[PDB]
Design an enzyme around this catalytic site. Structure first.
Site, PDB file in Angstrom:
ATOM      1  N   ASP A 111      -3.770   7.340   1.741  1.00 14.13           N
ATOM      2  CA  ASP A 111      -4.893   7.327   2.646  1.00 14.13           C
ATOM      3  C   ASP A 111      -6.004   8.227   2.106  1.00 14.13           C
ATOM      4  O   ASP A 111      -5.739   9.330   1.605  1.00 14.13           O
ATOM      5  CB  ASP A 111      -4.419   7.815   4.022  1.00 14.13           C
ATOM      6  CG  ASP A 111      -5.517   7.841   5.038  1.00 14.13           C
ATOM      7  OD1 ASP A 111      -6.002   6.757   5.399  1.00 14.13           O
ATOM      8  OD2 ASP A 111      -5.888   8.943   5.471  1.00 14.13           O
ATOM      9  N   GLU A 126      -6.494   3.924  -1.352  1.00 16.72           N
ATOM     10  CA  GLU A 126      -7.665   3.592  -0.542  1.00 16.72           C
ATOM     11  C   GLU A 126      -8.788   4.460  -1.107  1.00 16.72           C
ATOM     12  O   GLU A 126      -8.954   5.602  -0.702  1.00 16.72           O
ATOM     13  CB  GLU A 126      -7.406   3.867   0.943  1.00 16.72           C
ATOM     14  CG  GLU A 126      -8.613   3.645   1.844  1.00 16.72           C
ATOM     15  CD  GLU A 126      -8.347   4.097   3.268  1.00 16.72           C
ATOM     16  OE1 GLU A 126      -8.000   5.280   3.472  1.00 16.72           O
ATOM     17  OE2 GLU A 126      -8.465   3.261   4.193  1.00 16.72           O
TER      18      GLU A 126
END
Lengths: 797, 800
Positions: free
Chosen positions: A375, A450
């Site tokens: 993330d 990401e």
């Protein structure tokens, strides 16, 4: 090994000095004693604190053992060994030291001896046993009382299992499936079976999920990406949602309390009073069972920020151990906030790098996990903040204040990493990312970035990837497919053709935009050397609209997040197909049934790796809410009832398209297609429309053995007649037509269509296909298969 | 008095002859005595003998007995008569007629009596000569003194006696069906062709009884009327000879060359072939009509009253020529035969005795055989004024015939022949008394009349045949031409003309703005121009003559070499297209296109107002290898191929079968008045925007059922495909039924042995997104038929 002086007690023998390695609680192979080891360069005192579960519940410690700072310490690592320790005790640390609010000469120091903080290497953690269960109502903030508030009661760590045996893996190994073969299903452990219709023994648990795994094998998925399963606090901001009778959970779990411990409140056993280590074995069981069904496990991980927030958040672990090491800080002690969450982890400072790497290896080695999705990965490329080591007066014995509080600054007072890089600067060669990419324990572990953060840093197409070791969530794929398929003027046709090819315009592009700083500088070395399998393609995911909702709402509807919320993506690239939300207008519902399949067709008929959002395989709706982060409700639950129902045959369509892709090697590539692999067509063969006003993309794709596929997406509001390219001695045969009512939308043999049914449906259109004409409805999608010409087709069936 | 002996002695086979009676014409049983009365017209004869035959004698060319009639006793006016009691029932009869012949005396043109011949009673109830199809007549020394008969192909014929009293056919309550004309679907069949092939598997192939065994096929096909090619006695060997360069011989197969009008063709009778008395053909034919009627099939006889088998003067003398040539045939004053028929002679249809003959014939077939309709071959000839001669005058003392000016031909001052009433012979009359009589006779008032309203001298009366208040339908040759052109894709007015055809041709039967140069339409035809509905129009795309349906989509031009005449015979302009290659091909795209074009042509035929006629074999793709005129072949060329039918390799016969039944279930297509703007609406690629230009390749329409529903039909004859936008009828959706783009059985979505009700529902839901959008794709050269159903949104949910 030597005694360190602390007396024995009913629960353990005389303390020994112990050893600094390994970090954490471990069993000494010599003496059987539990060796305890914890890093802190900033602490003046450290006490080991042990709890019985009852004492823990009551906010009280059972035993405290003060570490000798000369003997129970080697460098910045404190250590002590307790022989014959009752192995049902739990542990934490009381850390005394300076605090900046009590002495401003020491910015970034945040010790608090009233807290007992968690071992960052805790193998399992106990605080509250049941999901949503409030912690006890103690007079928090009073003499001797442990814990912060009822939502943040005292947590403690489990000890290593001294007696008893390890988990039986039964030959289980991570699957090491080739990346390009993957079809990924993004799921949440609780939401997968929390719904009443799930019918499992332990709803919303690791054990509950195992019981419904056959579904995902049947669906054709071979990788599951789990939303965060590292210990988090779902009651983090528990309050009644304003203008509503619901309460605000942190449902998804992107706010990690402990990175080594599995989330206890996803464990059926811990919910039923088992020891805290039980969650470890429940998770091992889950992975084992996924592997039995040929399904890899990818963990979503959040090393960019922690649950401690900024200074107004709770001291649970890092902040009270060593705030200056673990978090990105400015010279005043202010928290950099590139995560948008309150704090930013100090990813590239050396002890932190080691922590994160140890964490990844732990999950691979102990839990047999197959991959990690990071993330906000951009944060892991940023240069850290460094402070000089604390000086002590040899005369006074006392701490000595330093210039700028010891922050290592530029001449203009800007924070720096110690080696000349201003803190926050994105690195071409970040040590953490290099370490992750090259560590031999992780060499067959998939890594997915990401590649952006919340401060506008965006590295897509040039995440530092060390020779193909990293794929990236492809957000361009998402926006492109949504724009093209709803029918939108602009460059969307060309951009869509590129997306079909695995987005080489992004991953094999060596001509960055003049304004893109990263791509022109730090990212330039990373702009090539990767194939299509580096693109993780998705149309939707846990945040944002669902597939069904993407096709049913122009705007978001986040009322349930509470009055005065400003939550959720503004620019959704969606179209409601005629009317906002549920409707009896038949032309609208017809169109939605089609566009669901068209969007899905795009996802699963492109090179690169498709990821499916839990529920989008059956048309799951969140009633237009594009940001369901706080809802422990049906909005985030897999709807086993709605799945069974399948009213217009969409789940059948998705399931068959998954299986058809898996069976088609031309879609599963490690190198980009060339002019002989793929050709572009329009209504006429080899006459593609790349203009602004285009509403048509179509292509042939060879199978290497003379066969191949014809694919077309008509996004126009008008019907079209396509001229199909003629292949010598061959004809196109129908497979996918999104203009057809189910099950004739997908002509494959299954429980609904016989081998006869399919052949009949192919022979019906034999005059159309032989002519090389195929009629397509507006907003529709076609897949044909090239077959050997057989003129007898047009005689009687 | 009819019972007083006329003088002629008894024989071993009959009693002394009696005077007899002039009426009725022919051979009849006197009720009381039970004797046989013989009566035959001849105004020009000087002597008549009744001649009697045993079959053995007949075959050996010899009379068994002869009775000379007394001219002053056995004659009343122009009717010669005689009665024979105790007549033996193994005997047949004819007449030896003596009088003048123009070759021997040029003063009497038109007279052609030959006493060497025994001629056939025109009212013969049955005829015997050769009892087997294609069996040559015996080898006799023909032409020699004593021997009767012309040549082996024209052996002596004779007429059967009337059936014995108390022995009549048992109809079992059979009546003519009297079905409404507009409800008919007509099947044009040949009795022998129907079952002659090996694959027919019937007990008596090629016969009336053979046809009975296969009637079920027709009932199942959905046909309710069969039109039989000429069923009246003819000679299939009339021009028998080897065809230049073949192992096959020339026959008159079809039979448009009548020898006797009152007698069933004997070599179509199984019984006659098995040696039954000659009247056996009568009961066999009756049985056939009864069997048709049981199945709801009407029977329509093709009849050829425009000319006979006797040809011109070079032809055989069989009947009429030998009895009263001046009366029966249309003659110029020199005795030349008018040839409007193109066959050597022209019957003198409107002269009074001949009119009586034709009427009596029609009532005979209706009364005695329960026939339902007649189809008149080259019917224009029945409108034409006749040839008249003054009665022959004789010297009162001398006795001798007396020669007259012009041979007694009634002529103009310029010498042109006339009908006696000032009309020049051949003139097409507005009010021909023959047709008037056919139209008005109460015995015929429920009998359907159909005209082939042209002849072989350029006279055309289509749209204006004298029809006496809608009492006649017509073969619509224009329908054929228009449909053929439109469907193959052709520039011109064909789209507009095709739309008229769909409507039952009001531009022909309803209108009355005659064409500038059409003489008939501007004159005799003008009172007949209107006052008719679409049921006046018999629509066809093909017939026994011309191409078959399958040959039209496989041949640009005729291939008649096997007819011997080196391809000169046959129609020149067939309006056909071979779909890309001449004859059988392996080219897949050509074969695809033929399968479609065969259906599109059939759709045009059966989705139009008016009465459709199907030609035998066209319902399964019968081919004559490009031969558009198989008049002369007794072979599989003219035989129903039961083997090909059973195979049905692209399901075309299923398509045709289901479309016939669908038509018949669709009352909007079966009309006695013309459709208006409320009944029908014309469309194109967009609703209400039809293309009537020269370059048009699309006719589409909606047809209301008057119950809120109806049909969308469209013919795309373009080489390109199209996306149709269908008209929106509120609360309703178009459902697919017929789509010739679809491979069988999906070309016709009706339930049957191949598609279950589930299959049909399934196939309809498949298309539900398209039809709900009111969008329908169509292939080039394709046809669709959609039905309006009430809106159901559930259709786009999962099928089952």
């Amino acid at each position: 090994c030597e005694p360190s002086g602390q007396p024995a007690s009913t629960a353990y023998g005389p303390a020994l000095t112990g050893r600094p390695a390994p970090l954490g609680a471990s069993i000494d192979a010599d003496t059987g004693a539990i060796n305890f080891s914890v890093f802190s360069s900033s602490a003046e005192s450290v006490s080991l604190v042990l709890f019985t579960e009852a004492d823990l519940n009551a906010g009280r410690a059972t035993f405290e053992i003060p570490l000798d700072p000369y003997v129970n310490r080697t460098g910045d690592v404190w250590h002590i060994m307790l022989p014959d320790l009752r192995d049902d005790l739990l542990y934490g640390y009381r850390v005394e030291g300076v605090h900046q609010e009590e002495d401003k000469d020491y910015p970034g120091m945040r010790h608090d001896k009233r807290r007992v903080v968690l071992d960052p290497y805790a193998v399992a953690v106990l605080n509250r046993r049941r999901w949503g269960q409030m912690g006890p109502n103690l007079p928090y903030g009073e003499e001797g009382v442990l814990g912060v508030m009822p939502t943040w009661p005292q947590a403690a760590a489990a000890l290593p299992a001294a007696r008893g045996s390890a988990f039986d893996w039964e030959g289980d190994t991570p699957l090491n499936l080739p990346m390009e073969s993957l079809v990924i299903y993004e799921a949440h452990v609780r939401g997968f079976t929390a719904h009443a219709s799930s019918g499992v023994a332990a709803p919303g648990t690791y054990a509950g999920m195992v019981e419904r795994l056959d579904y995902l094998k049947s669906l054709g998925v071979n990788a599951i990406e789990l939303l965060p399963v590292f210990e988090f606090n779902e009651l983090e901001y528990y309050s009644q949602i304003p203008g509503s009778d619901q309460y605000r959970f942190n449902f998804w779990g992107y706010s990690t309390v402990n990175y080594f411990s599995p989330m206890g409140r996803f464990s059926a056993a811990v919910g039923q009073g088992a020891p805290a280590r039980a969650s470890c074995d429940e998770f091992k069981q889950l992975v084992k069972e996924c592997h039995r069904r040929g399904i890899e496990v990818i963990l979503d991980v959040v090393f960019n920020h922690t649950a401690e927030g900024n200074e107004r958040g709770p001291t649970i672990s890092f902040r009270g151990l060593d705030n200056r090491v673990y978090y990105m800080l400015a010279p005043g002690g202010e928290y950099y906030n590139y995560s948008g969450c309150g704090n930013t982890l100090n990813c590239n400072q050396p002890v932190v790098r080691q922590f994160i790497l140890d964490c990844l290896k732990h999950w691979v080695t102990e839990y047999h996990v197959d991959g990690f999705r990071f993330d906000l990965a951009s944060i892991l490329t940023r240069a850290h903040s460094a402070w000089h080591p604390q000086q002590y007066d040899q005369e006074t014995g006392q701490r000595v204040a330093m210039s700028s509080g010891g922050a290592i600054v530029t001449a203009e007072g800007i924070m720096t990493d110690g080696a000349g890089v201003p803190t926050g600067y994105p690195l071409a060669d970040p040590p953490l990312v290099e370490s992750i990419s090259e560590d031999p324990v992780l060499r067959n572990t998939k890594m997915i970035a990401e590649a952006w953060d919340c401060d506008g840093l965006n590295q897509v197409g040039a995440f530092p990837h060390y020779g193909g070791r990293w794929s990236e969530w492809n957000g361009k794929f998402r926006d492109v497919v949504r724009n093209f398929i709803k029918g939108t003027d602009g460059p969307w046709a060309g951009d869509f053709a590129s997306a079909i090819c695995g987005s080489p315009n992004i991953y094999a592009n060596n001509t960055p935009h003049e304004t893109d700083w990263w791509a022109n500088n730090g990212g330039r070395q990373w702009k090539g050397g990767r194939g299509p399998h580096a693109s993780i393609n998705f149309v939707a995911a846990h945040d944002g609209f669902t597939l069904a909702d993407m096709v049913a709402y122009n705007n978001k509807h986040n009322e349930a997040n509470g009055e005065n919320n400003r939550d959720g993506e503004q620019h959704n690239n969606s179209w409601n197909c005629g009317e906002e939300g549920p409707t009896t207008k038949w032309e609208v519902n017809r169109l939605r049934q089609r566009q669901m399949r068209n969007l899905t067709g795009a996802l699963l008929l492109s090179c690169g790796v498709p990821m499916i959002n839990m529920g989008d395989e059956y048309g799951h709706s969140k009633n237009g809410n594009n940001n369901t982060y706080c809802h422990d409700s049906e909005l985030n639950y897999l709807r086993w009832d709605q799945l069974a129902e399948d009213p217009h045959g969409f789940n059948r369509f998705v399931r068959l398209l998954i299986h058809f892709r898996r069976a088609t090697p031309a879609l599963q590539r490690t190198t980009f297609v060339n002019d002989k692999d793929i050709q572009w067509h329009g209504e006429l063969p080899n006459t593609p429309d790349w203009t602004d006003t285009s509403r048509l993309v179509a292509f042939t794709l060879h199978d290497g053995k003379g066969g191949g596929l014809y694919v077309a997406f008509n996004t126009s509001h008008l019907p079209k007649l396509l001229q199909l390219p003629k292949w010598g001695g061959r004809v196109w045969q129908p497979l996918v037509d999104t203009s057809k009512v189910a099950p004739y939308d997908f002509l494959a043999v299954d429980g609904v269509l016989s081998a006869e049914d399919v052949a009949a449906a192919r022979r019906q259109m034999a005059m159309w296909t032989a002519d090389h004409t195929y009629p397509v409805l507006p907003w529709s999608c076609i897949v044909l298969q090239s077959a050997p010409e057989d003129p007898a087709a047009t005689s009687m069936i």
